[PDB]
Design a binder for this molecule. Structure first.
Ligand SMILES: O=C(O)[C@@H](CO)O[C@H]1O[C@H](CO)[C@@H](O)[C@H](O)[C@H]1O
Ligand SMILES: O=C(O)[C@@H](CO)O[C@H]1O[C@H](CO)[C@@H](O)[C@H](O)[C@H]1O
Ligand SMILES: O=C(O)[C@@H](CO)O[C@H]1O[C@H](CO)[C@@H](O)[C@H](O)[C@H]1O
Ligand SMILES: O=C(O)[C@@H](CO)O[C@H]1O[C@H](CO)[C@@H](O)[C@H](O)[C@H]1O
Lengths: 445, 445, 445, 445
């Protein structure tokens, strides 16, 4: 009435209450109605949010995701909950249980992947478990015992089948795999996707989120759904995808996340006496992908670039993905200072009209910028969380703390939206988004 | 490892997480396995705990309890969840759906009552709703519209059928109705309960809580279960119970709670323009029960006494029920100072061996005292909460704040036990007790 | 910075830092440059703010003020610091050292009084001291032994010399004694003050606060200063002031405070075994001034009126002093509901343009309202504190909490201003005002 | 009281109150009676604790200390307050005013130095100042303009005059310069100090701290004071001390601090456009002293050793200074894991008898350990702070957080003692130690 913002204790309670209310038993939905299934990197953040509440339940979330891992090691980006419709494309559309030789038995999953933040979740679970004593450490250690092999096969499938040429960058076959469906990053690559005779379909996402300004366009879904046909045509075979996919991009943000993830998992590997060969491979991949990320960077600004494998050209766009090198490290000293100056200046966190000192998903001074349209400009708490956590890991304590503080100030309305209008702070997209409650729960301590 | 206590934000999140994990949909269990149904005054406290998380869901909890109200107005102390066994005595044992003309249709309930803290819950819901704006106030106001009549019939059934002689004290026909099953208060009244040929039975409560020191004795359950037979024999008829029950006591703590509750509901009645006749009746009952409570008190110490209606004598015991007059008011000035001195001195909160400055359920210097045995000595957070809240209502801000502070310090292990050992602080009884999470959620703000 | 507000720990730290910065050694200035001496009711709030920091130093503050008490029991409203200039009217202009037979012998002070909030500060000191252990309890109990007689003579002087006709209201001979210099309450009384040959003077207050819209006018100071001449002419003789003073009002807000103070001090007397005859007198005065406040009240709204003794008429103004009866109690239930409704509705706390849900010194819909002008409209943290504390003592826990929370939100800029613009929140008057830091500390310490 | 610990707001308030109480105007005493002057590295921590309270006053603290800098760039370890007695050795005993050609002209100071934590305080001031807006930024930037040259001459004096052979370690001529007077690190060096005709003296430190188990022995003071005679004999001439001093050690902990300080100051120089030649020198010294620290390290555990220059041997002791390499970095990955394992295991933080998970000044399993005796065992909040801050800068967020939390839990008694008994938590040394209040404020402000 005079202040509709919640106290930190109220906010934490409401966040935990949302997370438990989205739990179907062994998996947590990403959002009640818009995303009523398990999503891959959402589940990682959800496990980060459960770790303060229940190490046992946080571990279960990851167990459920890994039970859906493909025979080649790929973690698919959706694990469908039994009987739940209302999300398109659903399991019938992917038809992975029919066509994919590597699809898991008695789980319905999608046929593409999503970024490897999972090792970060494992670290948070272990750090929480160490503060809780003997029996709770045993739960988390038993999880490592049971799942170390599966985490390795996840990291090895990325390194070996999505970086076939040892370039230290991850190749994607769908914008969905980047986590940033309609980012300006992929526009020119999608412009070259000319769909054929696409089996007719009817969206479900914009029945729930009805504002057209907040979701992709019907022209964009036509390209998204046509890439699926191309995959279905080759039965999702890794060896055949390079030859048939109309969309092939190296994703520098995904690559930087993978480098961090390998480094995190290698340190876990040493602390818990995992095999030396695995630890050595993880450090190898962390350095390889650190270097591949750095190779994309503007020698002046340090901004990281995506690469269109088909067009054979660098993708120059002004999104938060430019800051990938800050996550994983490796830039020369001068180039990193310039990139931090870009991050803090008028083109991103320093823009005079922003309500919060947070990272907009696209630069407000970019021609591509749209204040309400999903990844084309809104501020996403999940990015705030990932940048903050990675910055703290770099030693940039005060930078990390400013992002956390502004992110809590933004979240303190209690909507738990997935993204926010960068100028007015209006919550957008789905409310009750699980990974926004998780970010809040992890921040509050 | 060095400090297994949670931060206030961690504690609030864990409390909300427990409450949602105990929600079956429209009702919240009192504890996961020991009490897997809805209990009456537990549900009131649960609604207090839900009010910071969701006014809509808090209101639903009370709606579900009131849907189980009997035709004469009585709120029964258990509302059984469909299909759930593992609590004895269950619905088959009560047989209320068969024998009780006033039992509700399509709800299975017990046949006895429990204290009227419900109006207190309504106040907390309204106070929360007023801080949340237009649409949330409308939810809470619509609840008053829909349930004011049911709350009146609850209060009127207590005033008219459990105080038949207008003594301003509530008569009970079972120790369970007091909320304090095995309190020393009822020992001499139970000594006069000589059971007949009691249909054989097997407990469930001490299969779950296996420490015999923490639950009543088999001799005590034999008396508890024999009173049920006597009620069943007269088909739970109000008019016939005075003539047949082997246990008839006026409960001064219950009476004081009813006085407060009438006062609270009368003020709600005025603020929301309820009928004048109802408001006038509520103020009448609050004064009548204030006076009946005061009439029981030691003219020196102010300690309130229960009354054995059958033996026709005052029950002098040294439990926290002695402090009933502090809840509702009405003592002469000198007598209240003496009662507060008793509360703060070596016999209760001032006892030198207590871990926390909290109210033990029985005085540690009493011969009846048992440090682990349920209501014979342990510290109960639900009592801490009720005393604190009532003290604040009396204007005793600093007293209330000390109880809240010690109660949070006690709860900060995160067990959410129903009672604690008064000397060592060991959590006892059931963990994951819903009303202990609710107390914590209400305190933290 | 996107938000200039401090966290609770930063704010508490900054408030304590301020309070110690204003410490001259044995007295705390009311503000660094505007008020560089000890003021009487500021010193009580300073003692309250010191008590979470140091019971010993809080006791010293009251000891110093009480060492300046007059021989007849009056506590003067200013105790000047040795050799300190920069405030007018200074010691020279009051001439109490050469003229007042009752002025203290080794202290320079003013010649008029101020509200008796002192017993409230003694209660807060005692409440802190009991949480701090035995040597701290002993410090507080030794202050009681040393000063109980002085506090009694303070209250007795008010009850006997400023309520000569036992009307249960306090007579003021200067608007400064009300604590609200330029309140609209006193305009019609001040219109009947006609200065004679007033010795020339130069103001110092508006040299420091230069914005003329925040301080009284020259015309108003002409009358304030002439009243000093009338008192000097009769050498501050208690007996002669009814016959010579051109200003004589019964202050209903001062009277209500005295009622509370008497009741608080009587309860201290009982707890600490002070003479029964003293406690009885205090309870007698508490009741008399409660009744005296209620006799002024409007029959429809319960609003309290001041009385102009010279003109024999009730003073009807729309200022925060109308809510005096909420402080001391006494109104019939129906009239206090009306008065609470006036406090919360659109004329005070509920006015739609107010930035904070707080009590403006004058109603914004009154013709007397000026948003910048001292006591004619601005919101004063010190009044928020006093109403919050009195409301909690009435048992209005939620009301007291809402005032505290809005008070903290307003104070969270760290300006510690004496008063604030009610619509914009602009800090006004002196920054670094000791009693505003003291309010914040009590609300948080 | 059942728990003597303060809430975070009360603690922050009490720490700020203390810091202002020790303020003499332009300098803060290190403690009220034991150390009633300005100490050099205490003044840096005081600046850090002042920065959340007042950037202007924090800048003044450093300005005052830097106004006492010698003409050759040395910052002396004591700046005496005018006319203040009560500490020995006082200005008379040092005789720097009459003897030291480089002593400042309008300040009385000591003749030896102390660790260069000052650049860390400048970073904290700058970090606070950027959150506070433009006039505060301008205050901090103007301090940089005024004092950048003085900070450069401070670091240059250390790099050139105390590392004459460019070994990348700092040479001390007095155990007091290490900040750890009686550390076991220096015992074998002090055994080779043989006093000649030492002018008689009377201690003042153990008049204030009377418990002889908390301070050094007379024998130890005999050697501390004789070293002053050796320096006086050559008039504190930098060039002559290698030839005359009976004490010459390379302090590896001081060296690591200087490495960090150089790196922090170089980053400030870049951000604020200071001369490139200065920034290059700072990065050069940061690398040189990093390498110099790593060259001392044990090949199995990574533990750093001090060097006795006169005897030409590594000093192997088990004190917190072994963990110097954790501060500045430089160790091979495998050796730093071993060193972290030593820090956390049963010889330091993981010792089973420690009350708090904190770093004892000497390992409890060492033969040199004394639980009460100054730097021979007690836990010092100031070291907790420095390790926590350095650990966060390394990117060890969770490690830094655990030290902070245990540090706050230990400080929550409000004693603000300089050091604590490691097993019982008893506060020791001087209460009201300014740098302990400063640690708490930084951890909370
Ligand atoms: O819009 C969609 O259909 C899906 C496609 O997988 O994408 C969005 O929702 C997911 C669940 O929150 C997130 O994992 C993505 O990052 C986000 O962009
Ligand atoms: O032990 C039992 O079987 C039941 C009998 O109804 O009693 C206990 O559990 C209830 C649920 O928590 C509480 O309502 C009671 O107050 C408490 O004493
Ligand atoms: O303006 C003045 O000269 C003085 C005269 O007493 O009055 C103001 O300052 C005092 C000190 O803070 C307060 O005690 C008053 O309430 C406030 O009105
Ligand atoms: O004991 C002394 O006389 C002095 C000599 O410098 O040393 C102690 O006190 C100083 C001021 O707090 C600290 O700076 C030191 O680190 C600490 O060891």
């Amino acid at each position: 009435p005079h202040d509709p913002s919640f106290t930190p204790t109220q906010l934490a309670a409401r966040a935990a209450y949302l997370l438990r209310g989205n739990d179907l038993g062994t998996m947590t939905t990403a959002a009640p109605l818009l995303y009523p299934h398990m999503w891959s990197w959402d589940a990682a953040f959800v496990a980060i949010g459960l770790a303060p509440l229940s190490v046992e339940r946080a571990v279960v979330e990851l167990d459920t995701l890994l039970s859906a891992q493909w025979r080649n090691g790929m973690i698919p980006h959706i694990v469908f909950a039994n009987g739940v419709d209302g999300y398109f494309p659903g399991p019938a559309r992917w038809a992975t249980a029919t066509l994919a030789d590597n699809a898991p038995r008695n789980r319905l999953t999608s046929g593409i992947t999503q970024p490897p933040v999972h090792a970060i979740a494992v670290q948070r679970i272990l750090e929480h478990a160490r503060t809780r004593g003997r029996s709770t450490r045993a739960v988390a250690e038993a999880f490592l015992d049971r799942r170390w092999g599966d985490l390795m096969r996840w990291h090895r499938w990325l390194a070996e089948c999505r970086d076939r040429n040892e370039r230290g960058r991850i190749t994607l076959y769908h914008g969905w795999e980047s986590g940033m469906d309609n980012s300006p990053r992929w526009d020119s690559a999608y412009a070259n996707v000319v769909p054929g005779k696409l089996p007719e379909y009817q969206r479900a996402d914009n029945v729930i989120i009805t504002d057209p300004s907040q979701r992709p366009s019907d022209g964009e879904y036509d390209r998204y759904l046509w890439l699926l046909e191309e995959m279905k045509a080759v039965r999702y075979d890794d060896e055949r995808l390079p030859s048939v996919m109309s969309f092939q991009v190296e994703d520098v943000f995904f690559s930087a996340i993978f480098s961090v993830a390998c480094q995190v998992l290698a340190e876990i590997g040493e602390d818990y006496k995992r095999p030396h060969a695995d630890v050595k491979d993880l450090y190898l991949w962390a350095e390889r992908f650190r270097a591949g990320v750095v190779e994309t960077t503007d020698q002046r600004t340090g901004a990281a670039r995506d690469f269109d494998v088909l067009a054979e050209k660098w993708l120059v766009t002004e999104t938060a993905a430019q800051f990938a090198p800050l996550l994983c490290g490796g830039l020369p000293h001068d180039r990193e200072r310039a990139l931090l100056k870009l991050l803090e200046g008028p083109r991103f966190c320093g823009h005079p009209d922003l309500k919060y000192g947070l990272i907009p998903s696209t630069s407000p001074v970019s021609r591509d910028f749209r204040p309400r349209e999903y990844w084309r400009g809104p501020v996403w708490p999940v990015l705030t969380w990932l940048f903050s956590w990675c910055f703290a890991r770099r030693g940039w304590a005060e930078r990390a703390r400013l992002l956390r503080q502004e992110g809590l100030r933004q979240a303190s309305d209690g909507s738990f939206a997935a993204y926010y209008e960068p100028f007015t702070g209006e919550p957008l997209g789905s409310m009750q988004q699980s990974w926004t409650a998780a970010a809040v729960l992890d921040w509050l301590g």
